[PDB]
Structures are given as C-alpha cells and as structure tokens.
Amino acid sequence: QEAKKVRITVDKDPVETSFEKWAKPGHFSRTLAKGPKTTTWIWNLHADAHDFDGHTSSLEDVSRKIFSAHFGQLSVIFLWLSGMYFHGARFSNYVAWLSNPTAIKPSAQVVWPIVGQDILNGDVGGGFQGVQITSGFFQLWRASGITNEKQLYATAIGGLVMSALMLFAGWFHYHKAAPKLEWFQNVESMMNHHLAGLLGLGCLSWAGHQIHVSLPINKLLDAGVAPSEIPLPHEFIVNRELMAQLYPSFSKGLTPFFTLDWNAYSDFLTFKGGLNPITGGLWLSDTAHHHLALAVLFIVAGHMYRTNWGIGHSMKEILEAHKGPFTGEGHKGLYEILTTSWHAQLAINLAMIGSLSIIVAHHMYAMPPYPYIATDYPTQLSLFTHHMWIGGFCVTGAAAHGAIFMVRDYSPAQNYNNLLDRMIRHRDAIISHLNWVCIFLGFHSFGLYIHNDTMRALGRSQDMFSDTAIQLQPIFAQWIQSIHTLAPGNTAPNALAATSYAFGGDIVAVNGKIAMMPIALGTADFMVHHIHAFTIHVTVLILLKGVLFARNSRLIPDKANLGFRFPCDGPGRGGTCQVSAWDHVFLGLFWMYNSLSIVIFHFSWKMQSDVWGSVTPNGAVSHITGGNFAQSAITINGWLRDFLWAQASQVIQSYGSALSAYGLIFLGAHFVWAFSLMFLFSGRGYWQELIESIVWAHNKLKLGPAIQPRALSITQGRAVGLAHYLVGGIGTTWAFFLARIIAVG
C-alpha cells in the first residue's frame, strides 16, 4: 500500500549556491572536466549541456535537474510574454486600431532610424509609423477585451514579476529544497492535478474571464461604441445590473445554475456556431460556453486515478489487464518503463504536443476564433504556418527520444514478451510494408504530377488527370462536407448555424473582404492530399526504422554498445555510413521540411484562390489569384509557374518599400541554405587536412594555439548542415509568405 506514501520527500539544502563550479566549465562529465586539449571540447561543451544521463547514474539528481530547468524555461515564456504586452503599450497603434480594425494594419515595432533603416516603418495608419506585424496579438487583445493602453502596460509588468517568481522557483528547487525520486514517481497523483487543477481551473477561471469581461466588452465593441466610452471591466463585476442590460439572465443571478435551471443561461452560453458577421470571427458566447464545458469534465476526468484516499483507477492495473491473444503479455511492464526514464515520457509527450499544434493550425483557419482576424489574411497565414512547423519539429523529437530510450534505459530482462519487445521481434514486417506503401504512394501521387505534366507538354490535354480529363474526384472528402451542412437541424439539432463555413453553406464577408467561403474540394486535391499522405509515410519510414533498429540490426548486432549518437561502425560490411539512430532523426528531419513545405504551399495557393478576395454588394466574388487551382495546380510546372514564380513577384519587386526587409531575408535564406551543403556534402577528413595546411601557417609564425584546432566531428558536421538547411529552407518560405500577403492583401 501507499497509504501515506504519496507524501513529499524533500532534501533540505542539497547544493550550495556558489561560484567555483560556475566558472570552471565542462563540470558535468569526466571527459570534459580536464580542459580543452582539443577543439572537440568546445563543441562537446554545448552538446553535453542538456545530456543529463551522461552526467550521473543517480536518477534522483537527474530528476532534480529536470524540474528546476522547467522553471528556467517557464521564466523565458513570461519574459517573452512581457515583451509582447509591453510593445503593445509603448510601441504600438493598438489603441488607434480598435476604433477601425478593418483597414488599419497592425504594428508593434518602431525601428530606430540609424543606417537609413527607417524605411521599414511603413504607413500603417492610425497616425502611426512602424513595422507591419503578424503574430496576431491585436485580435487576441480584442478577444480578451483589453481596450486602453494602460492594461497592456500593467500586464507586462505583471508578467515580469511572474517571471521573477518563476525564475526564483527553480533556484529554490535545486539549492534549498529538492524533491526525491519518491515524489517524482507519484504519477497517479500528477495526472490528477494536471487534468483537474491545471486544465479544468485553467478553463473554469478563464470561463470567468470570458463571461464577466470579454463578453460585455465584445457586445459593446461591435455595436459601435468607442473604446473610451465603454465601461470598465471592474464595472461589469460590482454592478450586476449593468450586465443585466446586455444579457437579462444576470437579473436572476446564480439560482438557475445552483438549482439546475441551466436553460435560463442560454442567452449568453449558446450553441450558435459558425461565424459572427459583425466582428469577423467566432461567436464569443460559444467560446465562453466551450471553456466551462471542458472545465466541468476535465475536473471530472481529474479524479480518475488512484490517490491517497483509497479510490481511483490504478495505472499499474489497467495497463496489466490489457493482455490479448496476438499481443502476448499485453502491457505488463510499461508502467515501470514510464516512471523511470524521462526519455520514454518525452517520446510520448512530444508526439502529442507536436500533433496537437497541427490540430491548432487546422482548427484556426476554417474557424477563426478571434474578432477581426478573418479579414487579416497575413495573420491567418502566419498563425497557420508557425503552428505547422512546431508540430513538424516536435514530432521528429518523439522519435529522437523514442530511440534514445532504447539504447539507454531499455532493459530486456524487464521486458520479456511484453508489447515493446514483440515489435523488436518482428521489426522486418513493420518497415517493409511501410517500405512498400511509400513506393506505392509516391508512384500514385508524384507520378500523376509527372503524368499531367507530360500530357500538357505532349499537347494532348485530354489524357491528364483534371476536371475536363480522366477525373480523380475525391468522393470521400466531398461527402463529409455534405454531412456537416446537415449538422445544423438534423444531426446535431440544437446547433443553429454550421460547425464551420469551410464545408459549405454560405459565404461570410466582413466590410467587403471575405471572412470565409466554402472550400470546394476538386480533383486537384485528390492528388495533393496523396502527396501529403506520401511524404508523411516517408517520415515515419525513416523514424520508425530509427526506433526499431536502435538496439541492433543485421548490419550491426551490438549497435547499442557504441551508443546512441555515433558516426558508424567502419566502412566494412560495404560501408556503415549514417547507421546510428541519430542519423535516422537527421534523415527524418529533412523529409519533414520536404513534407511541411508542401502543406503550407497547399495552404498558400488554395486559400489565395478559392476563399480570399473581394465581394461586390451585388454578390460578385473576385478572388486573389482568380481560382487557378482548378487547372494549374495539377502539374509540377504549374506549381512552378503559377505559384512559385508568380506569387514571388510581390517579394522581389519590393525594394524601396516597407516590405524591403523581407527581400533581404528572402536572399538571406537562399544563402544559408547554400551554406548548408558545404557542411552536408563534404566529409571531415578533407577539412582536417585542409586545417593541417593552416596550422603550418601559424606554427611558422609562433601563432599556433595551445589547444588543438580540429575539424568538426561527423555527427557534429551533419548537425550543422542540418540546422543551416532548416534555417534556409524555412526562412525563405517565411520571407516569401509574409512579403506576398501583406502586399496583395
């Protein structure tokens, strides 16, 4: 039993906060504590900075290094959030933006006029000059209902003091009072408070902020009241009857909620759905209804697990009883896996918080949450693409530490015939059927794009795959849009408007600019979604080969004895170049950019052709690129001509304007991208012999360093060609996306 063994077990004053280990670096390992005889020591100082399992075998002081370092991470978020709210105060036009947010551009950066760099401060209206900016805090602060300039100045000084508490908390949990491993292995209580007292109260108190503040502000903003003439947020609390003049349910009080007459609160907790045509966004009373819906059953889902007081589903027992006929012993052993190694826990946490942020990017463009974000097509493009790439980067880290756990913390004595062992036993049939389907998909997705490109080149346009050709109609994806337009009335009978206007229904347009149009999925989207199904399958072809062949293979039967990150096992067996599980992540990261650039290119052409544009008061709709995705999207030359060559004209004809900083980054990240391939195509032994000429040029002149100037190591040399490629593969997509949509829209 653990009838008093969920308690706190805290060491008092473990580490003296001193200065002598603070200035003698490399102090976390035996191989780095004896000075830099070589220049591998400087690059090993940064690579072993967060490799805590190579520092101590004691898991108690490993897990105290994790918990204090999260406070250092969370203090960086509050310092960065203070930089957003302070630049809304002293360096912004947001207080001028609220009087007319339909045509005044957002601005949160005034550049110092120094080198003649003042031309980037553009005429963004409001009597204000500055850089046009696209992170979308301005529609967030209208969604929360910050009206005046003082509340942004108070939050950033309220956020800086929240960082100074959060930075102090990591100091207290490594130098005065540190928990033990008994406290960290109480995971049946950690999922209780995180479900209930983090996300439930994180919703329920936020539902308090939305009902009492953001709903009376955004009911008075869209009526046409100036933001100087709206009553204050502490007048919608101490005066109940002022809320009663907006929603008449507040004249009654708390008695419908306590006595369960909850249909009396329908006037401000509704199920409208769809959009709000006055302010250009989601119905805020739906969002105020959505948060306490999640709150009242996250706290219900909080009390699921076993705690101090007897009741609760034990996490060791629900896992153990899931055995089956095919699955051998079931999950017998996985609970001791996840409460010992953090890398096993990080490999599941990164796939979730990665692929929840891809859900964020898809559940934001077609359901615009924030008011007056619907007309601002630059903010929809930047908030899509940034939530893609974080969900693209954090998903390859799930197979980073999925492979780091296998070589370090996977003991096969504790894993006889359980569920993790059985896929190491049949790891040929996992990869080979994944190896077949990528050749099946890439012939059937990219091979059609060649086949439409040849038939246009060979003259015979009646032999490609188009609407006026051999049609490949996406009949499954065209069907579910016809279901969600019957989701009002029929299938969900209390939903008045649609669940989203992307599936169908009606257009919504705000001040002429189109808020949301129905997306008509045609035969050019059967192929580009199959592109997306292909290149996702290749990324899990490299990465699941990295996890299942992390221990051993038929090339190397003792791969885990060399470590996780090693270059090779010699040029024998024909050559073992890039054989580690590190290089599978290094190979798998490249196809992610070869995946996610296509997803944001499918975004930036379809939404520039079918939904965004202009609406005449008769009802005539004229889009930006004229709806050229019906024909020109089906060929690789059409992706080159009508999208890559054509939409980059706003980037490169933008010198002398305020978008001219983006043209420098557009040439900046062609350069860093073709700085990568020096680090990527070449080897090490060339440059080490090339450095060998230069050490002669210094030892002739008494100029040689006492440290040894070496070439970069091979995993280090593959890593610097990796990070350069993903700066120069993303930064020019960044500088072409932002420069196009600010210019044309």
């Binding site: 009597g127 002149l701 100029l703 006492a706």
Partner: protein, 158 residues
Amino acid sequence: VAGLVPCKDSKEFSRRLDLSVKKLEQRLKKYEPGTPPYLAIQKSIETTKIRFDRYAKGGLLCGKDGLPHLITDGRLSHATEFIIPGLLFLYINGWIGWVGRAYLIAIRSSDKPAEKEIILDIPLALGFMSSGFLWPLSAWKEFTSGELLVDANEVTVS
C-alpha cells in the same frame, strides 16, 4: 575626367536627388504636421539632401547612370575613396594580428595553457592589448630579430 564625368555637375545624379525626395514627400502628405510620424519623415528628408550635398563637395566621379563611383587606380586625388580607409583598416587590423600573437607567447609559458585560452587572463590580455598602436616598427624589428619565423627543420610538417 579619368574616364567618365564628375557627379558634381551631373543631370542624372541630380535627377536622383529629384525623384527620391519627390517620392519621400508623397509619404509626407498623408500625415499632419506636429505628429511624431511627421517629424520622422521630415528629418529623413534632410538626411537625404545633405547626403546629396556630401557627395557633391566630396568630388566623386560618376555619370551616365546617376550613381556614385570609385577609382582604385592608385590615384592620390582619389585617395579618400579607398586608400586612407584602407590605411586605417590595415593599421588596426595589425593590432589584432599582433596582440593575438603577443598574447599567444606568454600564455604558452604557463602551467595549464589549454584552459587559459578560453578562461582569459584579463590583466594579461589587456596587459598585451594597448601595445598595439605601435605594432609595425616592432613587428619589423621582430622580423629581423629572427624569432618571428621558426626554422623549417623545426615545424610541424607531413
């Protein structure tokens, strides 16, 4: 002269004065006088005019495209365009080239020289710093003393 025409009297160079301030005054007529974005443009108007009076009195040599050009045929009349920028450049390039060599001899006669290259001896690094405005009369003395160059039978070689 020396090829093309001077830009002290050049119609295309004076046209680049004309349409640039005509472009920049078009931004001025959408604001109101007294605002801080109005003063940010009008101060940026005069720093383009005085720039166009800097190159006129400087005697730059260009024409046929309205730009300024530079001459690096060793011309002493054109010494202000490349030579005395390079003579200040090569002056205290040769600080860092010499005091890095001066730092790397006294650090070799130490107990642990490997740690001392990234853990600085700041009273020695500044102690070998300010003897760097007077480098090349001492570096030439170092070249003819003999120990600036070690002998070829004691170097590292393949």
